[PDB]
Amino acid sequence: SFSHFLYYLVLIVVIVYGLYKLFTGHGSDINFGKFLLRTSPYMWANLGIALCVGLSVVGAAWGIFITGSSMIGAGVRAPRITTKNLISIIFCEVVAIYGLIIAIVFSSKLTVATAENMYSKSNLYTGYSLFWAGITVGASNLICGIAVGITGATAAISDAADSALFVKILVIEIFGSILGLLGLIVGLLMAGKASEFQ
Amino acid sequence: SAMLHSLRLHWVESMSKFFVGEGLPYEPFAFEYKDM
Amino acid sequence: SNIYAPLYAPFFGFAGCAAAMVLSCLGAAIGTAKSGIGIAGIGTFKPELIMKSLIPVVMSGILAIYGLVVAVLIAGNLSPTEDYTLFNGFMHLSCGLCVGFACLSSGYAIGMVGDVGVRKYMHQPRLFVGIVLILIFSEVLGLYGMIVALILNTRGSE
Amino acid sequence: MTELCPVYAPFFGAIGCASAIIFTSLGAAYGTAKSGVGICATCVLRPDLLFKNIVPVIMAGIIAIYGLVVSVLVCYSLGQKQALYTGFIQLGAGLSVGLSGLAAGFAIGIVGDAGVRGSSQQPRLFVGMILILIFAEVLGLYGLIVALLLNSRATQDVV
Amino acid sequence: MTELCPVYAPFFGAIGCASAIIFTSLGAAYGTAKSGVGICATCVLRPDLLFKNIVPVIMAGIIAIYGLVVSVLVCYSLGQKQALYTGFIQLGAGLSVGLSGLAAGFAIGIVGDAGVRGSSQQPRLFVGMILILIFAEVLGLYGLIVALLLNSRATQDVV
Amino acid sequence: MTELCPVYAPFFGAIGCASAIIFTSLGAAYGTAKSGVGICATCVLRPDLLFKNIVPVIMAGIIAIYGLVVSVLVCYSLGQKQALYTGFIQLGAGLSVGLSGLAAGFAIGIVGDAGVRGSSQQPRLFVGMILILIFAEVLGLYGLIVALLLNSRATQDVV
Amino acid sequence: MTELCPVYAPFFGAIGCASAIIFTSLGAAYGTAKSGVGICATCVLRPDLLFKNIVPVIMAGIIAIYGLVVSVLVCYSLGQKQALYTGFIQLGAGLSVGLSGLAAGFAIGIVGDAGVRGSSQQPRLFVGMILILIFAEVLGLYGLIVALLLNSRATQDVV
Amino acid sequence: MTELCPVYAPFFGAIGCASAIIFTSLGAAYGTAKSGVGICATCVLRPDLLFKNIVPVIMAGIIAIYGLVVSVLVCYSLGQKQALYTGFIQLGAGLSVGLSGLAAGFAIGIVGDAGVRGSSQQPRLFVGMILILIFAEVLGLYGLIVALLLNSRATQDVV
Amino acid sequence: CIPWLLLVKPLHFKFTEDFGDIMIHQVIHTIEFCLNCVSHTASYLRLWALSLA
Amino acid sequence: DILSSIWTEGLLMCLIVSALLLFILIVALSWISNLDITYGALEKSTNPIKK
Amino acid sequence: MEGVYFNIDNGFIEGVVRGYRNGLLSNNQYINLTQCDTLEDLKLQLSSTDYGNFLSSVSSESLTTSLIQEYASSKLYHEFNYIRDQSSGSTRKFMDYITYGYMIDNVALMITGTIHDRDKGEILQRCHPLGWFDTLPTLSVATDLESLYETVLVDTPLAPYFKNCFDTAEELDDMNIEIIRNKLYKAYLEDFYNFVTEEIPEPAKECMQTLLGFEADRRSINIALNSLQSSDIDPDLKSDLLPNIGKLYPLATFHLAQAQDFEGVRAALANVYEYRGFLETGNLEDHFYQLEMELCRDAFTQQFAISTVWAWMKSKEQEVRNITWIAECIAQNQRERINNYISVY
Amino acid sequence: YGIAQYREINAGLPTIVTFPFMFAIMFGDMGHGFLMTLAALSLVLNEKKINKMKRGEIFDMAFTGRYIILLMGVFSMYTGFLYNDIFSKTMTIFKSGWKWPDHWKKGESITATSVGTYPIGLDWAWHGTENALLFSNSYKMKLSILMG
């Protein structure tokens, strides 16, 4: 595979470069700490906010297509399900709204810091916190949406098979839909002590 | 789009609160022109 | 100021938080989705078996509670006005990896066992009990990642 | 080149102006292509539905409209000496609108194809498809909105 | 080499002049190839439609006209001592037309293949394919536009 | 930060606490999943064997207990100012137990699936599966022994 | 940290101690798994052969004994201030034994599966499988000889 | 650490001692496995040929002996203060022998499988497989030789 | 109120196997209602979203 | 105390942003290349037994 | 996972196929059909199912068991061909692979009719429509396989399956047709198993491997039992007919190849535990159909699988047979065996 | 969505107003609202003729919900008046509650001072202002929360 070959080549190049720097006495030249300290916290915060919204949306859309495509197929013979299983599509679109919400809350901390107080303890902490909280919310909402959509497709097919089945599969969705909520909560806890850039 | 997001706010947020549903639609025996 | 508490140490602590939450959610979602595809498949045949077959989804959710607990504990120890050691940050990065990947493994096992048992004990109602045992064994795998994470938190702050 | 406004700050904003259109046009193209495949498969049997199964191809284009809006707003905030914070904000605003539109388009396509294929058999399903499609479309909107909010901060209180 | 105008600034401009035409031509070639495959499959039965199923191959080539409009404009704004901001703007403009014309060409090819294959059976479908194709061809336009409105800023107010 | 005890030394030992539990749980989950699939396939016909075809799940679980024993021993030897040698030793122990448990769990899963599937037909095969599973389990114990004999040197004679 | 004995020298000894048991366990697990699959497939028909078709699972377990021997010997020669030459030697011994055991175990799994499957039909084939399996084991013993002859030089004549 | 003899020079020699036995064992294991699969498939019908279709497994074994001849030679010439030229030579010899043995073992396995499968039908084919196997085995020999002729220069005329 | 909503009605039914169905339905309804308050309050922000857009 | 002369923090930020974008673009293009036309509904049947 | 990428192309397909499945006649519906006193009553009862107004264009005097079978089969095939008209990529290849078996069956029906001088019109009417290819009626011109292959079947998707049928003599007869039909079903099943293993994702890879292993096992058992009637056939020749993908392979298939009597087949099937009682008692065909229905039911418990298109086609195909059977017992009035309608849904 | 339970509170009676007004909140423009009102009036005033003739599925749906669309347009006009949004522009009917500084130079960032409250709708003072979006977002988020 071209992708696997590229991955192996990148790994070999990284290993060779690291060994060359280490053996030549310059192992510290590969300083992830300096990279984190000198990379602008603005980049981390904005990447977090963009990835939060984007990944929450990606999971919502991914779930909506999985639930939506299985509702449409099952509704050819049982159109009664179309509106009944639409709650499934609301569990898929709600993660996105969580991400959006987080973006709004995290965007409030995207203030402009002064030149001297740019790479300080508070500003670097705010950058890391908003990057990783956005990553967490976005990935959790991605997983929750794709998983809730897979449950919603099963629920739609079951509802078409038998109406009484739906309420039993919706429970599973309610179990999955909480997974984004938890991520949301955890995100709010990460960026909780983060402050506007100053 | 806004007409259809109003429909969800009614079907999912408003009617989730009081609408039991699952009623029997009223379809009385009536004669209607049936087109071939 | 403190060389042992560099300002990038919170990056590692927040990476641990994200690993915990995201990977535990991935396990709980692999468990609830794959176990749920087994409960809907049987619904067409034994709808009556669906409510008892929610043990696998209940157990998968407890995997995202193991990662929520760990992430909450890690986040409570991260503050912009507190000296976070790069040791505390590595210890919170391992907490996240430990809980998240253990819960991912537990969620894959719970999705695989729940799905097949639910789709299988339609014919044999006696198999169900065994599922609950195996589902326990898988769930313990996540617990162990949680416990190790807790121990790694208690040692990161200290 | 100032501390806060390096020469490479415009790199991020210009990549955000591009990302918004490129990824909302990728999603819109995916949606339009799949919805058109479905429309061509169905209208062979049911041409009368054609000027009414065009809705998914109209929603995918609206995703492209959301990133032509974020792109044009981000391009007019781009400057030679604009701060790195502004550049990061403009990159984030294009990453958000572009990715959300990609997701929304990818979903609009898959769901429009299914709904046009099923509507040729069950007309009552048209309402179901349009409702599932208005929720795939709203994802993109939510990106635009975030992007818009980002741009509301991109140039303001910036030195 | 100035702070604002390094020697490597023309790299991004020359990469944009390239990328615009490169990706627009990739999309146009994809669209032309698939539409031509469809036209060759259909016109075996229906040659009379050939000089009218050539539309997707015309719409795919407007994608490359858009990429030539941006490459030619980006090229005349390329300079040895042109600012890094101008270079980044010229890269975003090429990527905007190029990767929005790639998507449009892919959509055009798929939709045109489907619509020529279905139009040999349902002539009324030809109008539906033309609407679906205007929505695909629209995407590329948007990129050109965002690429135009990025060249309007490339050399302006630049030191 | 001393020459021998850099600030990044705890990184490696922490990757060893994680590697021990990340990989012993991966192997134990693989084994528990495949053995459970086999048990569910067999006990449909032979429920009476269930409590006794659980052995591969018990064996896969001891693979995760091995990485918990190393993770908890490695985590109680971690320190803010612990030597780089100690960190490398704790990484090597975690890798040892984690990889050896992954391999043992894969072998346990495959062998247990095969042996539960065959034992529903040939009961005499059960003792044979238990022995082949004891041989696969053994591979995790060898990783635990190398990991435990690496922690015996992690903090000792270290400045 | 001396010129000849950097702080990172123990990194390659621990990776060799880990590699010694990590790859020898991978190969042994592969061999045990495939041989057990074959044994479970055959003993359904021929249980009487089971306590005699276990040989490949015993031969694949001597591969992990070869990596426990090098992991244990490489690990007692590990030190905080041990030379970089010693670290490279302990990495090369652990790679030698682990890779050679991985290959041996793969060969021992494939050959054992084939030979147990064929021995249920032709008992005279069992002797042939044991011979081809002795050849597969020598590939692992040769790596242990290279690894054991590498540790004889790891700490010796080293400053 | 001298200019000509850095501390990392032994790294290459150790990778060469390992590479020589690691790749020659990989090739030998591949050859032994495939030849054994063929032998097990054939001897079910023709056990009398078994102690004479073992040749490819004996030929794949010689591939590993070649890697052991280069690994044992490369290792007795490894040193803490051995020149970087010597390390590169010992890496090149180990690569030479191991890669040639890998190729020879692959050829031996494929040819031996084919020839044992065909010899159960045409005994006259056995001599042809031995001729093709002698040719595949001489690809490993030529590596060993190059490796040998590389070690004749590894430590010689070296400061 | 969460325990209230969850228990009062099923316990009233018990005190006057159907009680199992009542309890299951009440548990599902309570979880749905508690989650829906939040998910419905967040959802009505679509009014602002679409108006702003 | 600079990170590097060639791999400056600005260049690394630009490169990682471009890498994220290129990964997204690769995923999207892979997905779009997976677009397969549903021909069966596009060609006419030729079966006398049925259709 | 199965759900993530499955619905990008096959979500609508699986929904519609599972809707078709929900229309599969249940045991109660089969009993209701059994109580029908006439084919008119049978049509009225079927109208209450998802068959609906499928005989609405058929007059009372035109209702015959053959016509009912034809209309039900045509409905099934129209549904199948529609689902194919909505499928693409790997799924189109899978559904095309399902048709290749009907094509091999039609090639044998066409060439068997050509060698018996029967009218091409009737021979083509009896041919399975799903197994139609443009040049199928042209198999009614030549007798020897050489001309038929070099002129017709090279361009057909069956061309790769003509790699072991040239050994037989140039002159062609009924025994040679059976040999060619078994060789074409061995090569086809091996090719469809490979296609499933490489391209069809899991859990539709496992479900379709199991359902093709059952098909191969049934083919092998039937081939062995039919060769039993013949005076004698070379076991090597038999092995060239038995597919190599099933649970029987390679041990039970071998023993069947060298089997020369019914007790030999019984001994061969004794080793395999999935076909223990098939030959012990009862009707072998009914046992095979019941096992097939059980396997298809199991394929419906697994969602995000294209194995459900195969499981719906084979379930529905049994349903039609069942209806036909019932119709026969109503048309011919032999109701003693009416309840042998093999119902699993 | 579903058929109401027997003698259960009917959701159509409350939707008569709440479905158009929630749409109007989501729409909020006097120009677009007026265009939609005229489109609905075209159907309503010519309702007899359109009812007599045959209609397509989309046109039939539009005509059946002609009063729906009429109410949506009227409430959209009202909301856009409250948003002060007519074809993306604002109306200046009432005196603004904000007073810009007595004097300033071109390009000088000026901030207004609150001298009062706009009687009806959003004050036109923050039209085209840099911070206009921050006030609009706060107000409309809170409005949506309260209305929901």
Ligand SMILES: CNC(=O)O[C@@H](CC(C)C)c1nc([C@H]2OC(=O)/C(C)=C/C/C(C)=C/[C@@H](O)[C@@H](C)\C=C(C)/C=C(C)\C=C\[C@@H](O)[C@H](C)[C@H](OC)/C(C)=C/C=C/[C@@H]2C)cs1
């Ligand atoms: C989706 N995400 C999420 O948030 O889920 C929410 C979603 C819902 C609100 C819709 C969930 N709420 C729950 C609640 O539990 C239950 O109903 C039931 C029956 C729990 C009993 C079970 C099955 C216990 C198994 O673990 C046992 C045998 C497994 C093991 C290894 C052994 C032990 C000693 C368990 C240790 C921990 O596991 C402990 C038990 C766990 O400690 C953290 C805990 C107290 C979780 C929360 C449970 C609540 C009450 C589950 S899911």
Ligand SMILES: CNC(=O)O[C@@H](CC(C)C)c1nc([C@H]2OC(=O)/C(C)=C/C/C(C)=C/[C@@H](O)[C@@H](C)\C=C(C)/C=C(C)\C=C\[C@@H](O)[C@H](C)[C@H](OC)/C(C)=C/C=C/[C@@H]2C)cs1
């Ligand atoms: C790679 N081969 C290539 O280059 O082909 C060369 C020919 C070579 C073989 C020599 C081509 N010559 C042409 C010429 O026009 C035509 O034939 C036809 C019928 C044009 C009418 C069409 C289809 C119009 C659609 O776009 C409209 C509805 C699409 C949209 C989105 C709506 C708008 C408002 C966008 C308009 C722009 O698209 C505009 C039209 C474009 O602005 C840059 C332009 C002026 C292209 C050049 C056209 C020439 C005259 C096209 S292709």
Ligand SMILES: CNC(=O)O[C@@H](CC(C)C)c1nc([C@H]2OC(=O)/C(C)=C/C/C(C)=C/[C@@H](O)[C@@H](C)\C=C(C)/C=C(C)\C=C\[C@@H](O)[C@H](C)[C@H](OC)/C(C)=C/C=C/[C@@H]2C)cs1
């Ligand atoms: C995945 N969830 C999970 O974690 O499961 C947990 C939690 C569960 C309660 C849910 C588990 N608890 C157990 C408990 O024991 C048992 O049931 C049984 C029957 C144990 C006997 C077995 C089978 C022994 C085989 O190994 C032997 C022959 C294999 C080998 C190579 C030989 C040796 C000398 C190795 C010995 C070590 O193996 C030792 C035994 C192990 O030393 C670390 C240990 C003391 C594990 C914990 C066992 C508890 C008591 C197993 S699983």
Ligand SMILES: CNC(=O)O[C@@H](CC(C)C)c1nc([C@H]2OC(=O)/C(C)=C/C/C(C)=C/[C@@H](O)[C@@H](C)\C=C(C)/C=C(C)\C=C\[C@@H](O)[C@H](C)[C@H](OC)/C(C)=C/C=C/[C@@H]2C)cs1
């Ligand atoms: C998969 N898990 C695993 O690890 O299983 C563990 C733990 C189990 C208790 C569960 C194992 N314990 C054993 C024990 O022995 C045995 O049963 C038997 C019959 C051993 C005889 C065999 C077969 C010998 C073949 O090698 C020979 C002919 C192969 C070759 C090339 C020729 C030579 C000169 C090589 C010799 C070395 O190979 C030597 C033999 C080895 O030197 C390190 C050694 C003394 C291993 C220890 C084996 C114990 C006693 C095997 S496996």
Ligand SMILES: CNC(=O)O[C@@H](CC(C)C)c1nc([C@H]2OC(=O)/C(C)=C/C/C(C)=C/[C@@H](O)[C@@H](C)\C=C(C)/C=C(C)\C=C\[C@@H](O)[C@H](C)[C@H](OC)/C(C)=C/C=C/[C@@H]2C)cs1
């Ligand atoms: C799995 N690993 C492994 O080692 O198995 C061990 C297994 C035991 C420990 C149980 C093995 N012991 C052997 C012994 O040989 C034999 O039985 C026989 C009769 C070998 C004759 C063969 C076939 C010779 C072919 O090469 C020739 C014609 C090919 C070529 C191109 C021509 C030339 C001039 C090459 C010559 C070298 O090949 C030379 C011969 C080799 O020089 C290094 C050597 C002296 C190998 C060791 C052989 C021992 C005695 C082979 S395998």
